[PDB]
Structure formats: structure tokens, C-alpha cells
Amino acid sequence: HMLRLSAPGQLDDDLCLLGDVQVPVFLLRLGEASWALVEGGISRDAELVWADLCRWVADPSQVHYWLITHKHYDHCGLLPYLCPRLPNVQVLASERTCQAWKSESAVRVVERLNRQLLRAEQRLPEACAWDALPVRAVADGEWLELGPRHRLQVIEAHGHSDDHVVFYDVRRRRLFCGDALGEFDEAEGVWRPLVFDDMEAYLESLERLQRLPTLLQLIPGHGGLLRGRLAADGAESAYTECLRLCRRLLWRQSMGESLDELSEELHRAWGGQSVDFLPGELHLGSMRRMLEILSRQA
Numbered sequence: 001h002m003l004r005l006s007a008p009g010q011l012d013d014d015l016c017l018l019g020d021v022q023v024p025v026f027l028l029r030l031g032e033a034s035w036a037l038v039e040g041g042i043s044r045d046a047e048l049v050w051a052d053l054c055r056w057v058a059d060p061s062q063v064h065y066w067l068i069t070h071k072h073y074d075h076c077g078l079l080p081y082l083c084p085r086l087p088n089v090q091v092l093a094s095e096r097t098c099q100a101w102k103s104e105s106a107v108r109v110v111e112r113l114n115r116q117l118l119r120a121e122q123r124l125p126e127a128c129a130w131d132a133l134p135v136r137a138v139a140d141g142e143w144l145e146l147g148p149r150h151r152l153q154v155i156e157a158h159g160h161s162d163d164h165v166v167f168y169d170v171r172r173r174r175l176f177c178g179d180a181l182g183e184f185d186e187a188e189g190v191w192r193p194l195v196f197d198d199m200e201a202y203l204e205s206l207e208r209l210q211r212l213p214t215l216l217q218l219i220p221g222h223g224g225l226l227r228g229r230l231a232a233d234g235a236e237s238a239y240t241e242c243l244r245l246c247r248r249l250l251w252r253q254s255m256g257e258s259l260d261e262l263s264e265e266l267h268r269a270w271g272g273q274s275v276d277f278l279p280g281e282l283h284l285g286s287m288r289r290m291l292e293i294l295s296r297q298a
């Protein structure tokens with residue numbers, strides 16, 4: 001498809017995709033001797049993403065920034081394992097995201113879920129402590145002056161999670177939207193909602209993102225880069241699909257169904273796409289959590 005770029009390697013003049021398209025790390029060329037990373041992946045991909053990075057970046061001390069959308073295990077798992085190899089990097093993340101890395105119980109869940117994705121006999125590299133990460137907290141509305149032609153605005157986009165932010169490059173009409181629009185369905189071309197904290201926040205975030213100047217490139221947390229009408233219509237379409245799922249849930253509950261029937265249907269219909277980075281029971285349980293949130297706020 002011409003509207004979805006979904007291969008490793010160069011995506012635009014300044015932008016490459018590192019690692020696997022299902023849990024990518026994006027590499028921005030900020031200048032002749034300066035780079036940034038966006039999204040923080042899963043821990044087991046450390047040596048893959050490192051190898052890909054080194055194909056493009058001859059001197060990794062030139063990696064100066066690492067932008068992080070949110071605290072989920074699949075968006076920050078690389079940080080302890082590659083930051084020791086990136087001596088000049090500054091991790092840019094929201095206050096709430098930073099705080100999650102200070103919580104011993106929060107760190108435990110991240111580590112447990114990431115270790116469930118290790119291949120047999122696979123060993124992770126030396127790690128620095130989660131609470132020692134070279135982090136600079138960023139605020140809602142903050143302009144990140146990353147390079148002479150790279151200026152990205154932080155936008156709060158809670159609802160998927162209570163810490164989630166997105167990053168908007170208005171020069172390129174390019175939005176790194178993490179999981180705030182949901183999961184893009186590669187077979188059908190629609191958004192699957194991912195509402196795991198707050199439905200009203202999720203929708204309100206999409207309402208605000210729809211007011212941005214028209215997008216040319218929309219880059220979620222999974223599946224690659226979307227362009228053309230998929231980018232221009234993304235926030236609006238994500239909103240619509242979330243309402244569709246709420247109406248579906250209310251229809252079935254009205255027929256006396258338990259949340260478990262639709263949970264299993266959504267796991268059946270939707271769990272295949274993420275099976276290689278979401279450990280066994282986590283997709284089904286995530287679907288149930290989402291439907292619980294939807295049911296309580298509707």
C-alpha cells in the first residue's frame with residue numbers, strides 16, 4: 001500500500017525506521033553530526049535496534065535526544081539497555097512518565113513483561129538503573145528545539161494511559177502519536193481503540209489532535225508510517241472507531257451479555273496482529289480492561 005510505509009530503513013529524507021515495524025524506533029537526522037530517537041521499544045530488541053542504528057550513525061555519541069511517548073513496557077523497554085551505549089543522549093519524557101521510572105512497582109511490571117518476550121537463551125546487555133536514566137521532563141505545549149530544521153511540540157494526549165504525550169513536527173506536518181489513536185488494523189485499514197486508562201480523556205485528546213494543521217505523516221507506536229488520507233483523517237477516524245466500539249458494547253450488554261463475550265471476540269478478531277510483542281494473556285486482558293473502562297463511563 002502506498003499510504004502505509006512499513007519496511008525497516010529510510011522513510012523520508014530525515015527519518016529512518018529501526019528494528020521491527022511492529023515495535024519500531026524512529027531515527028531522526030537533526031544535522032550533519034546530530035540525531036534523535038523516537039519511541040523506546042521492547043528490551044529484547046536491544047541488539048537489533050543497536051545494529052540498525054549503527055548502519056546509519058557512525059558515531060553514536062551523536063545521538064542527542066530520545067523522545068518517549070508513554071510508560072508502557074513496549075514504549076520504553078530499550079532505555080536501560082541502550083542508554084549506556086549513547087553517552088550524550090537525553091531522554092525526553094513527560095513528568096508522569098519520568099515518575100513511573102522512579103516507582104519500584106512500576107519498573108517491576110515493565111521488566112516482567114519485557115522478559116516474557118525474550119527468546120530462549122537470550123541475554124540482555126548490561127543495563128543502567130531505571131532511576132538513573134538521563135531524563136529531562138517535558139511539559140504540555142513545550143517546543144523541543146532538536147535541530148536547525150527540527151522543532152517538535154509536546155502535546156498531552158492522556159486516555160490510552162494517564163501519562164501519554166505525542167510529538168508534532170509542524171514543518172513536516174508529522175505527528176508521532178504513540179498509542180493515542182489506537183492500533184492501526186493492517187488488514188482492514190481502520191483504527192482499533194486502545195483505551196486503557198480513561199475514555200473521556202482519550203476522546204478529548206483525539207478532539208484536540210484533530211484541530212492540528214492537516215497531517216501529512218502519522219506515525220503511531222506500532223505498524224509504521226501512515227500518509228495521504230490515513231494521516232489527514234487519522235484522529236477523526238480514531239474517535240469514530242472508539243464510539244463504534246462503545247455502541248457495540250452497549251448493544252451486547254443490552255442483550256444480557258457479560259463483558260467476557262465481547263472481550264473474547266475482540267481478542268479473536270484483533271489479537272493476531274500484536275502476538276509477537278504482547279505476551280500470551282495480555283491482549284485478552286487488555287481488551288477486558290478497555291471494555292471495563294468503556295462500560296463504567298457508558
Ligand SMILES: Cc1ccsc1C(=O)O
Binds near residue numbers: 074183222278283286
Ligand atoms: C498494540 C496493542 C494491542 C493491545 S494493547 C497494545 C498496546 O500497544 O498498548
Ligand SMILES: [Fe+3]
Binds near residue numbers: 070179
Ligand atoms: Fe501503550
Ligand SMILES: [Fe+3]
Binds near residue numbers: 074075179221222
Ligand atoms: Fe503500545
